Enzyme design. Structure first.
Site, PDB file in Angstrom:
ATOM      1  N   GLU A   1      63.461  -1.553  93.866  1.00 49.80           N
ATOM      2  CA  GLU A   1      62.778  -1.734  95.140  1.00 49.80           C
ATOM      3  C   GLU A   1      62.945  -0.539  96.068  1.00 49.80           C
ATOM      4  O   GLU A   1      62.101  -0.333  96.946  1.00 49.80           O
ATOM      5  CB  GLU A   1      63.280  -3.007  95.822  1.00 49.80           C
ATOM      6  CG  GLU A   1      63.223  -4.227  94.920  1.00 49.80           C
ATOM      7  CD  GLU A   1      61.827  -4.791  94.779  1.00 49.80           C
ATOM      8  OE1 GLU A   1      60.960  -4.455  95.611  1.00 49.80           O
ATOM      9  OE2 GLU A   1      61.597  -5.562  93.825  1.00 49.80           O
TER      10      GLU A   1
ATOM     11  N   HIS B   1      54.777 -14.991  90.501  1.00 48.39           N
ATOM     12  CA  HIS B   1      53.592 -14.143  90.430  1.00 48.39           C
ATOM     13  C   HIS B   1      52.326 -14.948  90.164  1.00 48.39           C
ATOM     14  O   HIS B   1      51.251 -14.588  90.655  1.00 48.39           O
ATOM     15  CB  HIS B   1      53.788 -13.076  89.354  1.00 48.39           C
ATOM     16  CG  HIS B   1      55.055 -12.293  89.510  1.00 48.39           C
ATOM     17  ND1 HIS B   1      56.287 -12.792  89.146  1.00 48.39           N
ATOM     18  CD2 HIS B   1      55.279 -11.046  89.985  1.00 48.39           C
ATOM     19  CE1 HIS B   1      57.217 -11.888  89.396  1.00 48.39           C
ATOM     20  NE2 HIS B   1      56.632 -10.818  89.902  1.00 48.39           N
TER      21      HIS B   1
HETATM   22 ZN    ZN Z   1      58.589  -4.359  91.871  1.00 46.88          ZN
END
Ligand code: ZN
Ligand code: NAG
Ligand code: NAG
Ligand code: NAG
Ligand code: NAG
Ligand code: NAG
Lengths: 205, 601
Positions: B357, B487
């Protein structure tokens, strides 16, 4: 007895430490004259993020004299401070504040998120031609991008002056910065502004 | 006044008016994703509707400038992305219905909990615990509960919503001149207009299915090796010929086989490649996890994290006073605001996701100087790969010694090279059949090849064939096990993580050639090479201005993803797994089920 006021100290406090600052499109210009410019108070400063001088040396200002000195101040974004320099381009340099190519003077800037948060600060986004050196455009006329004439703001008719939005959570580049542009000019003429070392030099009649 | 010149003034007015509107929309969504409250879902929707209404006017005004007249691809790419009537094609009610479905799905996932029939107030939610059971528990029936309860209580809430979400997203993509919503998602890899560097949407299906066929042999020998070591952990539970039960893998779904390392490490007597226990002994705080990740990027010459990053990010779980979407996300809020939302733990996984990240943020910080519309990765796979190139070099035993997590007098062995490469394959190789199958299912659902009465039938038919994973409990069409993943419930493409994996080994080859490395591709490192980071930065700063096909050629040398750097990275483990699998069956049977009966009639 009391040492006399043979010479006076330049009002750098009124310029740098001013409560409010001007917008870049309408930058404030103040003339500095008949005073001794002590640049040591500007040297003893940790907040100044920029202190670049052109044509002169930043260490020799307290020993120089100039016939005409101007002080220009405005609030611009962090990533736009680079445009306040000779030969630069961009929305600020082209349409708001343009330094001359052969510019002698100093450019000082510091972060002002603590004071200029929110605030009413504007910049010019559009213009028919690039600003000439030391020119000011305070016009509010719509920019005709297309061939069709403009009667009101619309599709191809944009309002020239756009607003800044300064927040504490913004990055450094998008945060407000207060710029003070000292413009120097020396001619074969009596001196109006001098350093502390050259205080008696031509500041006296 | 050329159309191109008056379109640049239009994009100039857009790039400046969109900065603050997008910023306030990101400021609202961040407050909701950290403070789930109905007050903050109105403020999010009120700010998001302001941004969506602003995009509709600009999309209509951008249609006045024909793309054929503009000859500047930077302007054309900007005008094209601004022109497309994304959601405007849908009716006012359909756009509000789809946004309600998109919102109800996201909240049900992050607020759904399974409660005790004995004590109703005894609830367990996925982020705090159901995930822990599926990560550390060794009980077949306990893992079966968290696995079935998450799909029979939350996935069942998502089944009738997903049916409507499909027909609405399909009507949207077709009105935007796409075949279906899968084609709309596949357009992120589309390049058109650059001779010798173009890429069609259908080429992604071909290249993925062509590259996946070359990963099948390596996945098979890893799946057979993992089957055996899972039988020792779960005796009389897994068939020596059948598929792995879905609830016995690393996580709730099987996305990553990382957590199976303790049950699978080949030479379990050597020092632990998993440095989780070292981070507790050498007490490590969330801050050090991100501070040490900062040193990795500083070392390659990439910038250190902004002051606002440390002030405005949420790196620890807040507590019981408020709820937050704990999925690791990186936020480019705009106007130089870069944040990370991670409910970090002391595990090695969180240490490696912090690099993933931060690689997102380093990518976001690089293309910040680009125009607003071009402020995005070349493709979704490029963005998710940047952090994986760093975590690939951060998980090596050589790098783990430098941060003091390994012993100062640690020795590397052929054995330690094997058990390290296996833990790499559990995360990298074990996720490829799961990711390919999840996207292939959705792609076939959006295309209409899988009818509604067979969504759950084909889902487990494909998980047995492609992934080699069998359901522990038979699942009717009242289930929506795909939607049980963040997701699939939060409207995010998944083929990113397949292309990501292939890119990260292509980028690591070129990045480790810029740096001086005369050794093998594994145990590599680029943690002090300001020359390898500059070769990475010269693509990070470009953004979506240049196509990913050309951006890949200028770094790794190829204009398409190559699986050979990946197969070469695991060559020591592949030849080793083939030796250890002489006593075991390499392959699986689509017919064995844990719920099948062992009797004739
Ligand atoms: Zn990612
Ligand atoms: C501005 O004011 C501060 C105190 O308010 C003082 O410390 C500083 O020296 C002043 N700067 C100048 C240039 O006078
Ligand atoms: C959560 O939201 C409320 C507003 O309803 C606010 O007062 C509070 O400070 C927020 N807490 C956190 C931790 O963000
Ligand atoms: C696209 O237009 C911009 C002006 O808005 C210009 O600076 C840039 O060089 C152009 N790009 C190309 C590839 O010509
Ligand atoms: C947007 O929609 C209008 C009609 O609603 C259509 O004429 C136009 O071509 C559309 N633009 C794009 C880029 O789809
Ligand atoms: C990078 O260099 C420092 C010395 O400045 C050293 O301590 C560290 O271990 C090096 N890391 C790598 C990966 O070479």
């Amino acid at each position: 007895v009391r040492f006399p006021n043979i010479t006076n100290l330049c009002p750098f406090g009124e310029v740098f430490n001013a409560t409010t600052f001007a917008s870049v499109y309408a930058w404030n210009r103040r003339r500095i004259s008949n005073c001794v410019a002590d640049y040591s108070v500007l040297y003893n400063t940790t907040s100044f993020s920029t202190f670049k001088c052109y044509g002169v040396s930043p260490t020799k200002l307290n020993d120089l004299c100039f016939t005409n000195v101007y002080a220009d101040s405005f609030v611009v974004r962090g990533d736009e401070v680079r445009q306040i320099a000779p030969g630069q381009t961009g929305k600020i340099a082209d349409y708001n504040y343009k330094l001359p190519d052969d510019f002698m003077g100093c450019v000082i800037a510091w972060n002002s998120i603590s004071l200029d948060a929110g605030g009413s600060y504007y910049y010019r986004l559009f213009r028919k031609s690039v600003l000439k050196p030391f020119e000011r455009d305070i016009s509010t006329q719509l920019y005709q991008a297309g061939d069709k004439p403009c009667s009101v703001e619309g599709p191809d008719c944009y309002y020239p002056l756009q607003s800044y939005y300064f927040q504490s959570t913004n990055g450094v580049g998008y945060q407000p910065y207060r710029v003070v542009v000292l413009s120097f000019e020396l001619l074969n003429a009596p001196a109006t502004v001098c350093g502390p070392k050259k205080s008696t030099h031509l500041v006296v009649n | 006044s050329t159309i191109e010149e008056q379109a640049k003034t239009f994009l100039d007015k857009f790039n400046h008016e969109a900065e603050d509107l997008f910023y306030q929309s990101s400021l609202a969504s961040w407050n909701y994703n950290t403070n789930i409250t109905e007050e903050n879902v109105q403020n999010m929707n009120n700010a998001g509707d302001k941004w969506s209404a602003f995009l509709k006017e600009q999309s209509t005004l951008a249609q006045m400038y024909p793309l054929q007249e503009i000859q500047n691809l930077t302007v054309k790419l900007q005008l094209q992305a601004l022109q497309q009537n994304g959601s405007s094609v849908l009716s006012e009610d359909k756009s509000k219905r789809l946004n309600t479905i998109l919102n109800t799905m996201s909240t049900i996932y992050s607020t759904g909990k399974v409660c005790n029939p004995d004590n109703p107030q005894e609830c367990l939610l996925l982020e705090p615990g159901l995930n822990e059971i599926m990560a550390n528990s060794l009980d077949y029936n306990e893992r079966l509960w968290a696995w079935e309860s998450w799909r029979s209580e939350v996935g069942k809430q998502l089944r009738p919503l997903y049916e409507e979400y499909v027909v609405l997203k399909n009507e949207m993509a077709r009105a935007n001149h796409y075949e279906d919503y899968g084609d709309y998602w596949r357009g992120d890899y589309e390049v058109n207009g650059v001779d010798g560097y173009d890429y069609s949407r259908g080429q992604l299906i071909e290249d993925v299915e062509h590259t996946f066929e070359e990963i099948k042999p390596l996945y098979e020998h890893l799946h057979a090796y993992v089957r055996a070591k899972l039988m020792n952990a779960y005796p009389s539970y897994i068939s020596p010929i059948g598929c792995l039960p879905a609830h016995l893998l690393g996580d709730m779904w099987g996305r990553f086989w990382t957590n199976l390392y303790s049950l699978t490490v080949p030479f379990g007597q050597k020092p632990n490649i998993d440095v989780t226990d070292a981070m507790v002994d050498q007490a490590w705080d969330a801050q050090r996890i991100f501070k040490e990740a900062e040193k990795f990027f500083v070392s390659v010459g990439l910038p250190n994290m902004t002051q606002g990053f440390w002030e405005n990010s949420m790196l620890t779980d807040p507590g019981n006073v408020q709820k937050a979407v704990c999925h690791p996300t990186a936020w480019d809020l705009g106007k130089g605001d870069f944040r990370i939302l991670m409910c970090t733990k002391v595990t090695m996984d969180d240490f490696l996701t912090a690099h993933h990240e931060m690689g997102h943020i380093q990518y976001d910080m690089a293309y910040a100087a680009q125009p607003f519309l071009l402020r995005n990765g070349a493709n979704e796979g490029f963005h998710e790969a940047v952090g994986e190139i760093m975590s690939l070099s951060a998980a090596t035993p050589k790098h783990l010694k430098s941060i003091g997590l390994l012993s100062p007098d640690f020795q590397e062995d052929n054995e330690t090279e094997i058990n390290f490469l296996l833990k790499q394959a559990l995360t990298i190789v074990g996720t490829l059949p799961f990711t390919y199958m999840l996207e292939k299912w959705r792609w076939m659902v959006f295309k209409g090849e899988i009818p509604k009465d067979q969504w759950m039938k084909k889902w487990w038919e494909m998980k047995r064939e492609i992934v080699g994973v069998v359901e522990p409990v038979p699942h009717d069409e009242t289930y929506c096990d795909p939607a049980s993943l963040f997701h699939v419930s939060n409207d995010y493409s998944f083929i990113r993580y397949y292309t990501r994996t292939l890119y990260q080994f292509q980028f690591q080859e070129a990045l480790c050639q810029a740096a001086k490395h005369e050794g093998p591709l594994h145990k590599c490192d680029i943690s002090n090479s300001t020359e390898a980071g500059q070769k990475l930065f010269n693509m990070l700063r470009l953004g979506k201005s240049e196509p990913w096909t050309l951006a890949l050629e200028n770094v790794v040398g190829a204009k398409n993803m190559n699986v050979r750097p990946l197969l070469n990275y695991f060559e020591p483990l592949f030849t080793w797994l083939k030796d250890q699998n002489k006593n075991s069956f390499v392959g699986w049977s689509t017919d064995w089920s844990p719920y099948a009966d062992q009797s004739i009639k």
